[PDB]
Each structure stands twice: as structure tokens, then as C-alpha cells.
Nucleic acid binder design. Structure first.
Length: 50
RNA sequence: UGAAACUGUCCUUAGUGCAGAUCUUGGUGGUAGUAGCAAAUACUAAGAAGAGGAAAAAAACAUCUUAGAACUGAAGAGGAGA
């Protein structure tokens, strides 16, 4: 579970959802050690729901 | 180095000697990898094509399809004419 409010606190509004995708990609890199990270379609849609 | 013309002496002739003219024409520096590439709300994900996203995150990736999110808001960023 990613406490995204810690990363997107006081962030520019037009760069919240795009920066959410960047943060997740960094956590997958620091964990699975793989640079090739592919997002599911559902995960992208949830991030942009709001 | 260069590959087909040239030189010395005496007279004669002159469009005859350049550092300057904000000189003319052309070429080139420091400035300097500097000032900048900041109006028009905004893009993200998967796939295809392509030499062209690689990687010790090189954090960004043009085009097309689908999905999400959006803008012009109908005296329009629509459809048509002089």
C-alpha cells in the first residue's frame, strides 16, 4: 500500500496524476530491481478517476 | 609545398607602395555553450510500426489505434463562402 498523500502533498495541481504514475514506477524499480515496469490499464484508470 | 611559365641590366610609360577615412567588399573572433527555446488550463496507460527508451531512474520518448482525463462551449478552436 502506497501512502500517496506523502508524495503528493502540496504538489502542483496539474502534475498530481502524472506524478502519481512516476512515483509508482520508482517504487517498482526500487523493489523488483527491474527497469521495465508495465502498468495495468485498470491501475491507470483508477489514478485518473478523480 | 607547388607543376608552366619566368628573371637580371638600361631607357620609356603609369590606374605604382596603405594602419586609420562610422572607409568599400568578403571572411572570422571574444561575448558564448552565455541570454534565451516560460501567453493560448493537459496529459496518462496498453498495443502497432520504426535504427530510433535506452538505464546504476538516462524521472522526459515524435506518429497511429483503444481506454481514461480534458479544452473551444455553439456571436465556437464547428460547418461553409467573398
Amino acid at each position: 500500500t502506497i501512502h500517496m498523500h506523502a508524495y503528493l502533498h502540496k504538489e502542483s495541481f496539474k502534475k498530481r496524476a502524472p506524478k502519481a504514475i512516476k512515483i509508482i514506477r520508482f517504487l517498482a524499480i526500487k523493489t523488483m530491481k527491474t527497469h521495465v515496469v508495465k502498468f495495468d490499464m485498470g491501475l491507470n484508470q483508477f489514478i485518473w478517476s478523480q
